[PDB]
């Protein structure tokens, strides 16, 4: 959210949600892209973030 | 490089920027000892696995001592079945692969 | 099971007396009380109808021979 | 409710037991189950457990069992004649022995829980020898049956070989035990009983033939309730019980007539719970309504089972016929507890338990109140009767017949029984009964016998409670302010009072010192310290060991001691004692009540000494049971037997106190024999007086043990883990880094998870228990209970041993490196030196 | 659907992303009416089910809101208060084994527990796999505190360094000063629970997994026992009390293994949770630690645990309200219309 809308230049706290949602994704990818799965923009997994 | 490092911690006891990305200095992770260093993961008596981590993945990632100590345990008349399920799997996997 | 039964079952190990049908009152610890009204006691005191009294390290009347039981009643209350 | 009391006075339809077991094997849940069973307005939750007689905030919240709790029930039996239940459940982790001990002196009844899956496990191994040196009757009770059907799935012919495997196990450790044969134990016996707290399962072979009886009818539920459980069979077309198959698949009748019932109705409340269960409970009489069939798994399953066995009747009745009455089994407790024994007039008054008769109750626990000023004592009314407002004279643990000084006149206050939160007021109490007496708290540290005043004019006291373990864990306590150390006296008194074998002790350097049996024992000690009694900031130094002294060989030269008169002159020799000689007599193998002659084989025959000494030895190290031993070896043409035997006593004195505290420091000396070889007294008993003896003696002592080789023995606990066979390495590895090494490593039958016994330092156990859970994730788990002593590594005495600042030292180092910062701890000399 | 896009991402050897904006930037929507309307809409990710196990939810399972109309399994259209059967729920369960860790007991989370985080907190210190967090009382000169004779080294015996889980276990002992320090301890007995895998196989049987027991009869450890036709005979009536039905049926071993199972699938039945309100990876980052990954996601880990055990200590009950719903006075209001779109 913060890369395709500017949001957190109008309110700090918003970083807050930004981390939290990219640490949510490094949590689902690192257990998305697992075995033969490789590297690549092929999870939709979004009810997490 | 132990011994350093806990006699060390024993001494330590006794005595604007819009950035996204998180800094390496939060880790907590890092331990002086081994026996935190390296956790024994749980094998789960073989047949439980993690969940977002993939199944087979995880098998044959597995240290396969349950799957020793089944074959020792395992008798002859009960193996049958065995060796038919894991084949049939194989054959029922195999159609996903092929 | 009857409440008499049932009364007579708890009522078995504390001091109460049983009168039987010849006049014979024996006052005890009621050791064991069967639901066929055989009570058996131990160390019980049996006075007889002519006024003799004496002591019974064992003793067990029948069912068929009860007249009477007087026992405590804290345990109802 | 009046019928409580009516009961009450009755002292034959009385039981005192105690649930006494392993460490969360569903002790504290089957009481529960009591109370659900008795109060109706008490009801368990859906999910949580209740844990009723959990009653203090420290257990509810760390889910271990602290302190035991009585409980006053009354129960009916098989035939539903009630009776009146003392229950005290203590706690099961082996670091909290001390309740153990505490409720079992105030007990006539045992009852064992073992878990199904588990097993005997190491604190049960411990409390069935406990109980049979206390004289109790035992009885075994598995529970958490539901484990080898819900979670192990065993068939139920390998269910009940698990059962009957864990039932003679512990007849085959019981006979090592038990000097008596008649202490078989089975469940056809009527011994053994098998429940399930969490379901409510709970069945003796005779109650589950009484089911059978009320399900069909016209049947003596006693025959058949023998004839269950064991090797015979059942034959559907001749019905009778043959020892032989009847046909080849055959099922032995335990498992074909309860085992295999219970398997079937609870798979078919956990399995096909929508569509089979209505015909399942149709054919068993057990009628549900709508709304209590849309619960989940586990209360389903605990509601149809409290409706198909009912109440726990197989409990009650495996109590009463199997543990004797407070009028039966008083003959053996006061033999074994009474100082006197029987014999006395007083011990002789014990036998019959009269209600009437002398009041000389026994009080072995103390349970605070909420706001923790005032602490109300628990005891057991041995013999007579006591009343509220009574004057009572309150005796203590010094107290004997000469020394008349240990005593109080007091007040009861208030009595009430209690059963667990809520607690009954009573004006009377009669004997063989229990009671929370209040007003008795000041006179009391720990035991207490409380009889009546100027009634009782020869009565002695109850021995001390003896232990199983020893407290080994040392701990400093310092206030954080000083000018509020006052603060923290008191509630070191009260922490004092609150536990049996908490050890306060003030040292010389200014030092409050609390002894212990393990970390989750000071853990749970301390928070009572802080945030219950004393509600005041408190420093605590990280914890140490108690350590021993000991020799491995006689000393180059027989040094001596005179006293300053130079007169008197003793020479003794310290040498160690014989392998397993120490362990002979903390187990009260001999004692020094014992007459000459029979001290005299004993020595002749199982340690071969002379009898020129085996009838020369006076004393055993420091008190009664001490590992020392004091030697009279001077030959009587140079020391006059008559001149001797009048210092016979001081010497011992300044022995049994020399002993106690040790030269190189403060600790306790062990494992020393001491041999007199000259003894030059004086002739008047004018300057040979004890001021002038005993410090001869404990000099003449040290200079011994010090010019003996001496050596330091730390205490090595006893730990035994159960962990999945996938950690037992991982087990090993944890081990290796703590100076520890493993015993044995021995699978448990019926079960994946494993049992590793091994010793490791009590000082390098220190996180132990958490740095194994952790290593392994949660999987493997510890237990920790002092074994042994062991001669530290290394020589204690060498000057040229360096110890720096903040770093282990190796095992050459360990001997200095102990006692010198002990030394240091206690405030003496950097070194130690012949003079002492 | 984790399960799906895991194979798509294997099968699709490059991914063609979706435009965004998708639609043409700075240019007014498509009209509903016109375009979306008559467009028939592609399939959507779904699983297909195997008939021969996963029957029982078959017939609705991805609908969008299942068994609304089954009066059965569902209270009405509020839709709250599902009661499901065991066949369903194990269907469910199984299905759901890739977002479900399969621990029986709690005894992996000992020191990741909340309370154990909360004891952290409260003393300043961090377990290694834990969060950190900024003291609760700064309390820096008492962290200087000064060389006593308590305290002082020399007098001090270090075998095995006090480390932080030490001090976290046992909060009254280790260290001083624990104010608003909490406890767990709580070694529930870990359950031993074997799951089958056996899809034929007796739902009690003695896998190689038990130790076996060993039977002995070396010693006459004899019993009271009879002998035949010894004082004692049978009724032709009694019987034990279940011989009709079997000893295990075949949804005996789901039931068991349903037991078990993480806390949404031990249910029989429940309330109904908002979309919103399920956490689907919540017990992923409450785990122990993961297994050997790179540092940007460790630290990932420990600042999700962070908000959680913010939020969790944070927490205080509801304000008691009066419930004036919002849009039900827009419904009162007659500005205002309802329609299904």
Known sequence: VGQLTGMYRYKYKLMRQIRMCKDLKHLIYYRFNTGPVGKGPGCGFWAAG | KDKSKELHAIKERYLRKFVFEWDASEDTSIDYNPLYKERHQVQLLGRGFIAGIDLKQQKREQSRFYGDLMEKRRTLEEKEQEEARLRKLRKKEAKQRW | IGVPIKVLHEAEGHIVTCETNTGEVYRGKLIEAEDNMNCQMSNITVTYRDGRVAQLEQVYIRGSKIRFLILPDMLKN | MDFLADLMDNSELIRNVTLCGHLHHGKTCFVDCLIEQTHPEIRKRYDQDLCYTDILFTEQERGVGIKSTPVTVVLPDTKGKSYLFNIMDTPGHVNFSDEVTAGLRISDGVVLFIDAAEGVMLNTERLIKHAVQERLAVTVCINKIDRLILELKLPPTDAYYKLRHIVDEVNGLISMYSTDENLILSPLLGNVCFSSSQYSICFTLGSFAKIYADTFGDINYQEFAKRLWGDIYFNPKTRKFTKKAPTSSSQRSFVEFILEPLYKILAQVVGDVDTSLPRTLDELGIHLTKEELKLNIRPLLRLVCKKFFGEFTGFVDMCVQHIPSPKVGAKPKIEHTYTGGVDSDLGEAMSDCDPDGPLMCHTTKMYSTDDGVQFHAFGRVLSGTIHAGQPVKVLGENYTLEDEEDSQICTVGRLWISVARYHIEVNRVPAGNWVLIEGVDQPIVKTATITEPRGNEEAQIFRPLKFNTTSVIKIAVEPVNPSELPKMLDGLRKVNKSYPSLTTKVEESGEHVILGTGELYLDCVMHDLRKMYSEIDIKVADPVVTFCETVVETSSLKCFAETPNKKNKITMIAEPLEKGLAEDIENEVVQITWNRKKLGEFFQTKYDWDLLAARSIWAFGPDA???????????????????????????????????????????????????????????????????????????????????????????????????????????????????????????????????????????????????????????????????????????????????????????????????????????????????? | ??????????????????????????????????????????????????????????????????????????????????????????????????????????????????????????????????????????????????????????????????????????????????????????????????????????????????????????????????????????????????????????????????????????????????????????????????AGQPVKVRVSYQKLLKYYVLNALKHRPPKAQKKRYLFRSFKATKFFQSTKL
């Open chain 5, 1 to 290: 659907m984790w399960i799906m896009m895991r194979r798509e991402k294997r099968d699709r050897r490059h991914f063609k992303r979706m435009r965004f904006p998708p639609f043409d930037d700075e240019e007014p929507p498509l009209d509903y009416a016109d375009n979306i309307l008559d467009v028939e809409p592609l399939e959507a990710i779904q699983l297909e089910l195997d008939p021969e196990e996963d029957a029982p939810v078959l017939d609705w399972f991805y609908d969008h809101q299942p068994l609304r109309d089954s009066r059965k399994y569902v209270n009405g259209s509020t839709y709250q208060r599902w009661q499901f059967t065991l066949p369903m729920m194990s269907t469910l369960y199984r299905l759901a084994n890739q977002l479900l860790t399969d621990l029986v007991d709690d005894n992996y989370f000992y020191l990741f527990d909340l309370k154990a985080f909360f004891t952290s907190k409260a003393l300043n210190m961090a377990i290694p796999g834990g969060p950190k967090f900024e003291p609760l009382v700064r309390d820096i000169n008492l962290q200087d505190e000064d060389w006593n004779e308590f305290n002082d080294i020399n007098k001090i015996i270090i075998r095995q360094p006090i480390r932080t889980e030490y001090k976290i276990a046992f909060p009254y002992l280790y260290n001083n000063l624990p104010h608003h320090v909490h406890l767990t301890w709580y070694h529930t007995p870990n359950v031993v629970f074997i799951k089958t895998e056996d899809p034929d196989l007796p739902a009690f049987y003695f896998d190689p997994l038990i130790n076996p027991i060993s039977h002995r009869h070396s010693v006459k450890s004899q019993e009271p026992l009879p002998d035949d036709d010894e004082e004692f005979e049978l009724p032709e009536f009694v019987e034990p009390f279940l011989k009709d039905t079997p000893l295990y049926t075949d949804n005996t071993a789901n039931g068991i293994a349903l037991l078990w199972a993480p806390r949404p699938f031990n249910l029989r039945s429940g309330r109904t949770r908002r979309a919103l309100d399920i956490p689907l990876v919540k017990n992923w980052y409450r785990e122990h630690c993961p």
């Open chain 4, 625 to 836: 049971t001490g590992p020392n031993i004091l030697v009279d070896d001077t030959l009587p043409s140079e020391v006059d037997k008559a001149l001797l035997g009048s210092v016979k006593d001081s010497i011992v004195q300044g022995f049994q106190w020399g002993t106690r505290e040790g030269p190189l420091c403060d600790e306790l000396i062990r494992n020393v024999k001491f041999k007199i070889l000259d003894a030059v007294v004086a002739q008047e008993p004018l300057h040979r007086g004890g001021g002038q003896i005993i410090p001869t003696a404990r000099r003449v002592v040290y200079s011994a043990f010090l010019m003996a080789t001496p050596r330091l023995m730390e205490p090595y606990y006893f730990v035994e883990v159960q962990a999945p066979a996938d950690c037992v390495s991982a087990v090993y590895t944890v081990l290796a880094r703590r100076r520890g090494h493993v015993t044995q490593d021995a699978p448990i039958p019926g079960s994946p998870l494993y049992t590793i016994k091994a010793f490791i330092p009590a000082i390098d156990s220190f996180g132990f228990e958490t740095d194994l859970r952790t290593h392994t994730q949660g999987q493997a788990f510890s237990l920790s209970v002092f074994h042994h002593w062991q001669i530290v590594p290394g020589d204690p005495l060498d000057k040229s041993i360096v110890i720096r600042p903040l770093e282990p030292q190796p095992a050459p180092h360990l001997a200095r490196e102990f006692m010198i910062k002990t030394r240091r701890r206690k405030g003496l000399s950097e070194d130690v030196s012949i003079s002492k």
